[PDB]
Design a protein around this ligand. Sequence first.
Ligand SMILES: Nc1ncnc2c1ncn2[C@@H]1O[C@H](COP(=O)(O)OP(=O)(O)O)[C@@H](O)[C@H]1O
Ligand SMILES: Nc1ncnc2c1ncn2[C@@H]1O[C@H](COP(=O)(O)OP(=O)(O)O)[C@@H](O)[C@H]1O
Ligand SMILES: Nc1ncnc2c1ncn2[C@@H]1O[C@H](COP(=O)(O)OP(=O)(O)O)[C@@H](O)[C@H]1O
Ligand SMILES: [Ca+2]
Ligand SMILES: [Ca+2]
Ligand SMILES: [Ca+2]
Ligand SMILES: [Ca+2]
Ligand SMILES: [K+]
Ligand SMILES: [K+]
Ligand SMILES: [K+]
Ligand SMILES: [Mg+2]
Ligand SMILES: [Mg+2]
Ligand SMILES: [Mg+2]
Lengths: 524, 524, 524
Amino acid sequence: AAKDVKFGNDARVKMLRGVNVLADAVKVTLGPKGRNVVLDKSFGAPTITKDGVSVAREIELEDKFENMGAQMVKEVASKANAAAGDGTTTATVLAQAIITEGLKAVAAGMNPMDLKRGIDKAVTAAVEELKALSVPCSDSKAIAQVGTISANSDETVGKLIAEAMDKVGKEGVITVEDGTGLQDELDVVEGMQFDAGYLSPYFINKPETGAVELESPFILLADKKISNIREMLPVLEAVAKAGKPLLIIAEDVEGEALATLVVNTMRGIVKVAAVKAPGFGDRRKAMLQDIATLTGGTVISEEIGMELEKATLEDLGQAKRVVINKDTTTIIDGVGEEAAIQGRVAQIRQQIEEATSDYDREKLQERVAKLAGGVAVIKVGAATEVEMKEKKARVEDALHATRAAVEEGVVAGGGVALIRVASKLADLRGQNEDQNVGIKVALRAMEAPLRQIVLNCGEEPSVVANTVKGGDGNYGYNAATEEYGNMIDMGILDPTKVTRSALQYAASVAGLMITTECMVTDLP
Amino acid sequence: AAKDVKFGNDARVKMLRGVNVLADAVKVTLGPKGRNVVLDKSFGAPTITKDGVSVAREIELEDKFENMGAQMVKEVASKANAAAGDGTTTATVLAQAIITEGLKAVAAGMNPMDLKRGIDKAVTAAVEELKALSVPCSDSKAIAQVGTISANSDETVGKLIAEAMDKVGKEGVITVEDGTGLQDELDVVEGMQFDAGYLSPYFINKPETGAVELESPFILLADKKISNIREMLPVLEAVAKAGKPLLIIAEDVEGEALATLVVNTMRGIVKVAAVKAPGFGDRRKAMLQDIATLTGGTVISEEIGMELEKATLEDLGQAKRVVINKDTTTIIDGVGEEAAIQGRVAQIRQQIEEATSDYDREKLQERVAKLAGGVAVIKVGAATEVEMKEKKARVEDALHATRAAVEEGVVAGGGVALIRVASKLADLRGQNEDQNVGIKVALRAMEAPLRQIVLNCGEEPSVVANTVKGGDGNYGYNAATEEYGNMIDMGILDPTKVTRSALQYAASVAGLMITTECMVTDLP
Amino acid sequence: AAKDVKFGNDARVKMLRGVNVLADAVKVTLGPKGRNVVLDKSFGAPTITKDGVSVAREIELEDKFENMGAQMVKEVASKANAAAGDGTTTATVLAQAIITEGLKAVAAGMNPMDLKRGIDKAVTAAVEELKALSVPCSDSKAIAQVGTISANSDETVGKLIAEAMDKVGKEGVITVEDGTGLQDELDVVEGMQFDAGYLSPYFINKPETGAVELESPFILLADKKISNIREMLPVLEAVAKAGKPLLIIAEDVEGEALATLVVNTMRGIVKVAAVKAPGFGDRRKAMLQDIATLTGGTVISEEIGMELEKATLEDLGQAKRVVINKDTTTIIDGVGEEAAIQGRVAQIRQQIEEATSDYDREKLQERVAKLAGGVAVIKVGAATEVEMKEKKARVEDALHATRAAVEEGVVAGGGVALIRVASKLADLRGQNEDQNVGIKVALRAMEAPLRQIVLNCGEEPSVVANTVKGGDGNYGYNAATEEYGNMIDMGILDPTKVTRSALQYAASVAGLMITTECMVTDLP
Ligand SMILES: Nc1ncnc2c1ncn2[C@@H]1O[C@H](COP(=O)(O)OP(=O)(O)O)[C@@H](O)[C@H]1O
Ligand SMILES: Nc1ncnc2c1ncn2[C@@H]1O[C@H](COP(=O)(O)OP(=O)(O)O)[C@@H](O)[C@H]1O
Ligand SMILES: Nc1ncnc2c1ncn2[C@@H]1O[C@H](COP(=O)(O)OP(=O)(O)O)[C@@H](O)[C@H]1O
Ligand SMILES: [Ca+2]
Ligand SMILES: [Ca+2]
Ligand SMILES: [Ca+2]
Ligand SMILES: [Ca+2]
Ligand SMILES: [K+]
Ligand SMILES: [K+]
Ligand SMILES: [K+]
Ligand SMILES: [Mg+2]
Ligand SMILES: [Mg+2]
Ligand SMILES: [Mg+2]
């Protein structure tokens, strides 16, 4: 098809306008004081939301050049949220800030490449500054505070996550579920999570999460060298009449006929998923039986002579809920007797101190953490079905952010961290003036989140920013209470990974737009 | 699809317009002097109504932003109606008033978050104030009055609800059914209601109200806990032959049993439902025999050596209609013989005289109230199928609003209650001027129903409002006779629940629109 | 879908326009001198008609608001003719006069509710004046005149009806069906009519009369409600194999039974129809037996231990024809033995001497009336197909108007009665000035029919109206002969009910339009 082709400022103005539409709609929702955005549906009542992610999903523009701008920022901002578990709105605000000033500098005739170079140097520096400024998240009070902030000021979610980690540890495995109702519930059941992905896509159920999920699955374990689908048929008939889904764990899955396992489940007849066994040699086999003892079943080894059609249903292990993934498999509520589990845990212990090299000492210590660790299950309570499912969503978001906070620590929220990092960079320079201006563009933009938060409050951004800047450290503005104080003392905490990622991704896409001379799209 | 995106004032003006169209159409129908609205239909003659529910249901606007505003207020007014059984028009009027004055303040530069805070603070105060002002609805004269108001102004439906309660008690069981015609008839049959619900949610044949409806079902009463589906078969077969659905009331239904029955129920092979028998020990036993006597069935007791397999079709009780929701089971028109039910009642009244414990005595009297209480069935009237089906949702709503009047009491009608409460709130203040303005916005809005009622009379609303304010308590304006008097004495009563539900729901949507900065919809 | 919403005077002009189109098209056909209306067909030559009903049927307007106005008046005017046997054109002419003046008064700023009250008050008074002005219709002469007038000066029709009543009595049961030959025929047969409608609308054979037609069918009589199809199987199979339709008369038909019968009737297969047994208690049982005695059939009761599966073809009664309306059911030519009927009549007449209640006396005498009275059948020959249906439809209208003449009496035709009544009300007043204007609106409207009748004659309405006014009593203008004289003497008679119903219905719809603030319809 023939193309519409724009260059230079003509192209760049278009991009900026589309970015301005996306950002202006997303950014009004920033903060505890964020405004509502009404999102139409083709039927019934409109959706009213303060959630920036929801607002961003909906944005598509008629003008194809403007729309290219909006989509570029959208993709980048969502990458951030996927990496750190939060910060979509903050990233979008940043992108708009850098993009606006950067383009201003381009139009003034400054070197675009130099502007991009300077923005990058500021960001590289800003990221280091954040690492230094960062502080560990350890005590459960701080952890609760992080969750609460990610749950949009809901002290219950943060209280739930902190309670979960208080059971299975901050590094422990945690899964969220729908409860019977009316109050949050917490139970630590038997189960484990190991790293394996599903061997082929299309296995995904509930595609929004992009992870496969089953309910009360049968579990199969083998060496997997085997042959292929044709031989293993006999076990497939028994399950079909249960009926129960099957999760096959094996050294790998090679077979094409084995790859015809994925297809027929697409037809909906029987729901199944296959996943590899982690590691090689005696290490993976010991872990195969590790899973067998947990799920109350025996592994099938073509070495020992055991054949897959020789394996009865009761012989195959079983669990309650299982969630596999691209990088991960998780077993919830394994039906294996606690006598088999604890009996083996003491054995893993025995091998520890007989083992000499510290590499065997560790990995082995990893398996004992899985069997003896279990899986924390958060059952979300509420008054209603729809009022519940929302909260299950907010708990899942707060969880990843808290995980983030555990890894890289926390910083002053409310955009205080970025504002402090900017002051620390005041003396930063590049190789020439253009790069210098690029650095200043990035530093000015670091003020955007706080100002937008303040703006959504109905307060003067210049006034709060000026007052905050006149203070030091963790001194900042609490937008909920309209008070200045110590942000950490007040419980307003961003995971450092989130703040970092938001800046990096925004600077990425901004660098590209600033460096764009040409756009090509179809004819309207 | 590409979207149309509007911000701030430009957006809010559109919302206000849509609200204005919706509310201006709906509010002319408020109160005894309400004007007619003609509603078109694709085929045949138009409909003419004073009922705001019918008018609002029909409103959809061409401009997509305007339409969003209207749908927003609509959703909120219908929720009010679903909660209190009435108040749709009042809710809509309050909504337009709060929104109108709030948006004025926003465009005058005031803080929307503070405006919303003031509104919320004022409504909260008003809700307590209403609860204090509330007075009990007990005597038959008052119930008929509340029914007539909820009618509206139909002494037939109003009276009819009174005998219904007068016969079965104000706490009694009253149900609305289609009826043959051409009048509405009230029948009292043998039936009761106890607290039990579907052991599985999958048994629901009516998703809207979320309940199980079995027509002319057989009823199985067994003491044993049901686990294996095998022992059920001899009875399950005989039930499939008869062509009637089955209801299972037992100690419990679990394991293979609960799993099996719900499996086939989803399929076409069976229509059935099961519930847990209420109570424990001898009471659970005594209650099962209660239900047995009502339905003409025999309790199957594994204690005596009675087995499920031996249980025949005659052993099952029968009823015309049974309704199982989440929290309760309702058995309508049991087949049991009066001589037996009367004897069963006589037996229990004996035990009451023999009762040493006040607790044991209260529990027994609850058993007779259910057995001797019966169930009130209202079969809806008129002629054609269009009104007849529509009328049923009316009387149901009227009955609901009447129950709510008995539970939460009554306040002066004709918008007088809101007027009074707004006077008690004259000294109420917020944190800042903008919250004060919000409080005043809400307090003026509370005058809107009475003013609108009067305006529909062709009378000056400011004179009537001012004259009512000058009086105290229940002094108000009777819009039927165009004369002042005592609202309670003149029989003009609102369920307190309706009034507060309308205020709360209206202030909800108003706060949302006042805090909306962005709207997203499809292209024109 | 999105709607077009109009308010106030803007809406009411549109409504007025559509009313003016309808009424101006229809009113030219009023009276003996009515003009021609040409009605186009999609092919060939146009259709020419003096029939006001045919003209109204065609009117649909492009502007949806205007069209709403026209359809509102058609529907109501159509109702007068359904409850009377005439008056549709009179009602339309009346509606337009009231609507026009009323709407003009509203636009002038007068209180619409007050105007409606004044109109209603005048109509109530006029209805009373009509009642006092009314005179009995007794002798065969006046009965024939009433039928003649409603048949459009056809003396054959009034003569035929009067012969029907001369046999079976003025309150007797009469039915008109297709004439076999060129000449009409009248036969009195044993049969009855009672009030039962079709339980479902979904079975009616002929769309124009909206009634069920069953030829030589079976009649089922059951003392129980039938909730299950399985009890009707043995009898239902017998009937389908006999090549005869089935009429079901029971305590009720509901559940799977009714839904199924609207299946195997509506869809195809054999024709069947069901009606409720009139009344309740023992009167329902007594009445069921009455039908059984008349139809030569046996009542099936659970009370004696009878069962429907045991019911053979011999237990069912039968007749030659059964016509089931919405309101009524008519059995024509019962198969029962006269010795059985006369013995049943005697037993009922015996219970009358034993009756201790005056209510019991009256209800017993209407059963002896149905049994002993029988039915008068009218078969009307036109000499050709198209003329027979047309004439037969005139006889059906005249018959209905004659019953109305019998019940409420007759008054002076040519719109003389309304003029006379309007001159008696000249001093009638109201609560205030607006009501007074409302009364005058009604009184002026009362002259519209006479004036239109004269205008259609081509004389001056003003002159003739004034001459009639200046006379007294039954003095009026004969529009056929163009001479004045006594309207009763000249044979021009309107059943009081027709004049009444015409005025009342016209004033009803006019009251609604005068009180309308809003109209909702589809986008253009
Ligand atoms: N009480 C508060 N005062 C100031 N800032 C707050 C407060 N609560 C939350 N925030 C800030 O709001 C930001 C997150 O807002 P949010 O609307 O969730 O956007 P994102 O999608 O970027 O997480 C964080 O920077 C957080 O510190
Ligand atoms: N005689 C009366 N005088 C004044 N107000 C009345 C009278 N009768 C009913 N009302 C009031 O009219 C309102 C109900 O109007 P309605 O059209 O039903 O609106 P809604 O849908 O909000 O119930 C109630 O507040 C009720 O008290
Ligand atoms: N010879 C007559 N002279 C004067 N008026 C007549 C004569 N015959 C019939 N009418 C009048 O014509 C009117 C009947 O109008 P018609 O054309 O049948 O419309 P509709 O019956 O639907 O009102 C009656 O008021 C009747 O009195
Ligand atoms: Ca739409
Ligand atoms: Ca249409
Ligand atoms: Ca043509
Ligand atoms: Ca009189
Ligand atoms: K937010
Ligand atoms: K109303
Ligand atoms: K005519
Ligand atoms: Mg967040
Ligand atoms: Mg109401
Ligand atoms: Mg006529």
